[PDB]
Amino acid sequence: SDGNIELTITGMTCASCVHNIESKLTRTNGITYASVALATSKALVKFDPEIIGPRDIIKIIEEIGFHASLAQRNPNAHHLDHKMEIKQWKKSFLCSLVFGIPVMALMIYMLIPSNEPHQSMVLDHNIIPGLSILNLIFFILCTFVQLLGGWYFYVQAYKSLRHRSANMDVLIVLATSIAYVYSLVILVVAVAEKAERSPVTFFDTPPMLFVFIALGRWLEHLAKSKTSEALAKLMSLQATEATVVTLGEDNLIIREEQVPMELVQRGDIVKVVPGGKFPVDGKVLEGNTMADESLITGEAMPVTKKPGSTVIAGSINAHGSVLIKATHVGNDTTLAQIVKLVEEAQMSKAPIQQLADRFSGYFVPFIIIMSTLTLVVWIVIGFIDFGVVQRYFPNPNKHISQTEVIIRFAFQTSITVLCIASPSSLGLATPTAVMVGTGVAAQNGILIKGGKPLEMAHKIKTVMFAKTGTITHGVPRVMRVLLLGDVATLPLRKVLAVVGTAEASSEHPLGVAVTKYCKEELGTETLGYCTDFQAVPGCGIGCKVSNVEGILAHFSVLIGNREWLRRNGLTISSDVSDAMTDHEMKGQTAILVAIDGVLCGMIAIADAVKQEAALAVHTLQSMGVDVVLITGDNRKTARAIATQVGINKVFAEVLPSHKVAKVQELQNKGKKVAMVGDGVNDSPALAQADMGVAIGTGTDVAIEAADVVLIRNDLLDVVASIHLSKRTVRRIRINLVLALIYNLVGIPIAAGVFMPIGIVLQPWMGSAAMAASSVSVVLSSLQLKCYKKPDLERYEAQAHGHMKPLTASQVSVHIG
């Protein structure tokens, strides 16, 4: 609400543009954060609304020379499709191929010697002194290529040099310009002096530079388009037409209408036919069916839906036509929230990505400086100490003097050095891997948001687990009810009815189960009235019950733990003390009822622990990550559940108000701690923790406290999360190695340093080996897509044999 803005910018091609925009925006006063993503081609800037406005930012960006505008809401398929760029580059490569094949044929013609040549290759026969017939052909072809094929590069270089910064097309422009000008000058010198021999000139590389450049920029765009497959699949899945119906009295169809999404609103009734997707989230009215949403949440089995259930906009119906009342319309749908989260994920760049962006702005000037230095050093060493070079170039040619071979070698090695560096490979090394990892995660339920949690999960050594709703099923079950007081004046019917109607005021997850159990067991769905309902979280509920004749025809009630009754001045006996201990030791929490100070009895509550908790924590123990449990109930139940699952340390009897002090002391030791809670309930604890993991959040992915969201209520997904995140971060580092080893080896070789060995590359060879790096980086990023999601048997395989049982003795507890 601080005037945070998100913008779309068009025309960002190079990897040096990001550093320019980020630095220019940050340096301006009134702005503290501005991150721009090339792949998404968007920007996220936060600023003081009073000091500056959005139009000021737009004007600044346009002053830089880029077209910026406010972010659109639905239309983004073209942004991630890259269709226009692929089409343009393929067309340019096909157009430039017409001037490439003749040059390749001419070059290969001279190298291979015919066994019985017709005239022994008289295609180089001089026609007028100094100008060979071959050199005229190269001159014509090179002039046509320069004036017709390189226009786009010249335009980009001019539009870049109008400002201080320079894109990566400046390298190509300088390479071609030097290769043309030097050759033209040497040809003019040869013709003017009427020399007999035509010198070897640089008219063969410009016809060969552009072909390879266009091929590389077409293949790399085609490969990049494969990185955004998950985004395209998610975005082009929601429907655009809805069948609005009208119900007269008994849901009878008055009429039918076809409506777009921008006109349908909440509360409307929409019908879905078999084989059709649900257009809008809502509540099922009538009809039993089943639908599969493997393209949204990732499970394989088809969930069955009954009248009154929930639907997801994007799942495909199978059986019958179902009427649903719309609840979340348009952007409020789960799919829209998921895709918005995914797009926003590629905005919080990692520190390693920040370093890469910093190193991507001082690369083009560095390459130009290195090229000029190489040229100067070669010319000086040629003109000063001819002995060293002539040791490797011994033959004194009469056709060309030793003075004019040094200049040729220096220019060749000063062109190849700046025609081999690939700033793109260093630029897009990490973002493509990040996008592929986030997409492959989203296609499996895991919804890692932001780039920072990707590397944050790599170094996490402590995972923290909540009890209610995370390790347990979250649906309490009542074992049995024990009576300790009187039976005549306090029958089971009376106590059950009064406790049900007393808790009906509350909405705690444990109490709804016992209230509905009372309603179903007493045979009456009615209840009394509750007054003076005191409800202290972590302590209990105390109130008064009136109208006790509504159920008994077929009262200070205190519900809480021991300290609750002690607070209200109620004594506790020893028989009651050891009564429910037998059930408490079996992982079943028990509550004690006291009506008017009378120890009426005990009610046993049990919740089944999830099966995956038996393995999910164990793998985490075998992965080298510590685990801990937090719960607010009594110590014995926490010990029982920890023994049943296998967590050593536990923080029991924690009140639901602090919830951060334990996380604070855990983080005080220097480790990075991630807590796996439930969502809105444990927001402060997740916010304090470095990585917030919200498990069991169905259609509730709009959570800001947590930086990792899991939709499927599966603990193993947590194991699937970290085990994936590392495999992304590693894939980033490799991407930043191939972009450096190529750069730190392609420069010395193109610099002629390997002359004593005898390794010199023609400038065309320096660009045919440049597209390779750009394609290979994206290809290595794409390798993450080959990810088979592990199953229960997969985890059982490596976990078989070594799974140590534990007793209550080897279980720690909290500290005060």
| DSSP for 679-698, written as a single string | SSTTHHHHHHSSEEEE-S-T
496: nearest Cα among 477, 476, 478, 521: 521
Q: Cα–Cα–Cα angle for 118, 121, 127, nearest 5°?
A: 115
Residues ≥6 apart with Cβ < 8 Å to 310: 281, 283, 284, 698, 699
Number of C-beta neighbours around residue 472 at 10 A: 20
Query: 63 near 47, Cβ under 8 Å?
Result: no
Judging by DSSP bridges, how do beta strands 598-606 and 477-483 pair with one another? Answer: antiparallel
Q: Which helix (H) or strand (E) holds 529?
A: strand 529-536
- How many helices and strands, by DSSP H and E, does the chain display? 32, 26
What residues form DSSP beta bridges with 126?
Answer: 132
CA angle, 184 then 412 then 216, to 5° = 100
Structure's resolution in angstroms: 3.3
Rounded Cα–Cα distance for residues 315 and 647 (Å): 38
Nearest CA among 397, 465, 428 for reference residue 695: 465
Helix ranges, 162-205 (H): 169-192
CA gap 449, 442 in Å, rounded: 10
Residues 576, 578, 579, 581, CA torsion sign:
positive
What six digits make up the tokens of 791? 């199953």
Place of tokens 């895991």: 446
DSSP state of 237: T
Contact 528/547 with Cβ under 8 angstroms?
yes
d(CA 406, CA 411): 9
Contact 75, 339 (CB under 8 A): no
Q: What b/e readout covers 131-145, taking b as 16+ CB neighbours within 10 angstroms?
A: bbebbeebbebbeeb
Contact 337, 701 (CB under 8 A): yes
663-672 long-range Cβ contacts below 8 angstroms, 24+ apart:
663/464, 663/688, 663/689, 664/688, 666/462, 666/464, 666/628, 671/461, 671/462, 672/456, 672/459, 672/460, 672/461, 672/462
Contact 684, 702 (CB under 8 A): no
Other CB atoms closer than 10 Å to residue 117's CB: what's the count?
9
* Length in residues, the chain: 816
Residue type, 363: F
CA-CA-CA-CA dihedral for 483, 487, 489, 491, to nearest 10: 70
Apex 612 CA angle, 606 and 613, nearest 5: 60
SS3 (DSSP) at 717: helix
Q: Select from 54, 60, 67, 72 the least CA-distant residue to 26.
A: 60
How far apart are the two ends of the chain, measured CA to CA in Å? 40
Output DSSP code: residue 164. S
784 backbone dihedrals φ, ψ, rounded to 5°:
-65, -25
User: What count of Cα atoms within 13 Å lies in the side-chain half-sphere of residue 42?
Assistant: 20
Place of tokens 């109620």: 570
* Residue 695 falls in which region: left (phi positive, over 0), alpha (psi -120 to 50) or beta: beta
- Spatial contact of 478 and 642, defined as CB atoms under 8 Å apart: no
The C-alpha angle with vertex 433 and arms to 460 and 345, in degrees rounded to 5, equals 65
What residues contact residue 329 under an 8 Å CB cut-off, 6+ apart?
261, 264, 265, 266, 268, 280, 281
The SS3 of residue 264 is coil
Task: Check: CB of residue 493 under 8 Å from CB of residue 704.
Answer: no
Task: State which amino acid sits at residue 663.
Answer: V
Distance in angstroms (rounded) separating the CA atoms of residues 617 and 608: 17
Q: Which domains does the chain have, with CATH numbers?
A: 5-72 (3.30.70.100), 239-332 (2.70.150.10), 477-606 (3.40.1110.10)
Question: What is the spatial distance between Cα 629 and Cα 666, in angstroms, rounded to a whole number?
Answer: 12
Contact 71/6 with Cβ under 8 angstroms?
A: yes
Task: Report d(CA 769, CA 371) in Å as an integer.
Answer: 18
Per the DSSP assignment, residues forming a β-bridge with 667 are none
What contacts 434, CB < 8 A, 6 or more positions away? 346, 350, 353, 451, 454, 728, 732
C-alpha–C-alpha distance, residues 442 and 193, integer Å: 71
Rounded Cα distance between 74 and 645, Å, is 46
Token pair for 339? 């895709």
Cβ atoms of 418 and 175 closer than 8 Å = yes
What's the token pair of residue 672? 């990075």
Amino acid symbol at 397? N
Token pair belonging to 140: 């014509």
Strand (E) or helix (H) holding 155: helix 151-161
Q: Which 3 state secondary structure label does DSSP give 236?
A: coil
Written as six digits, the tokens of 732 are 């980033």
d(CA 551, CA 498): 9
Contacts of 764 (CB under 8 A, 6+ apart): 204, 205, 208, 209, 212
3-class DSSP state of 643 = helix
Query: Is residue 651 within 8 Å of 467, Cβ to Cβ?
Result: no
Instruction: List the one residue out of 232, 269, 202, 217 whose CA is nearest residue 96.
Output: 217
Question: Which pairs count as long-range contacts for 615-618, CB under 8 Å and 24+ apart, including other chains?
Answer: 615/716, 615/792, 615/795, 615/796, 615/799, 616/715, 616/716, 616/718, 616/719, 617/465, 617/645, 617/646, 617/647, 617/715, 618/646, 618/799, 618/803
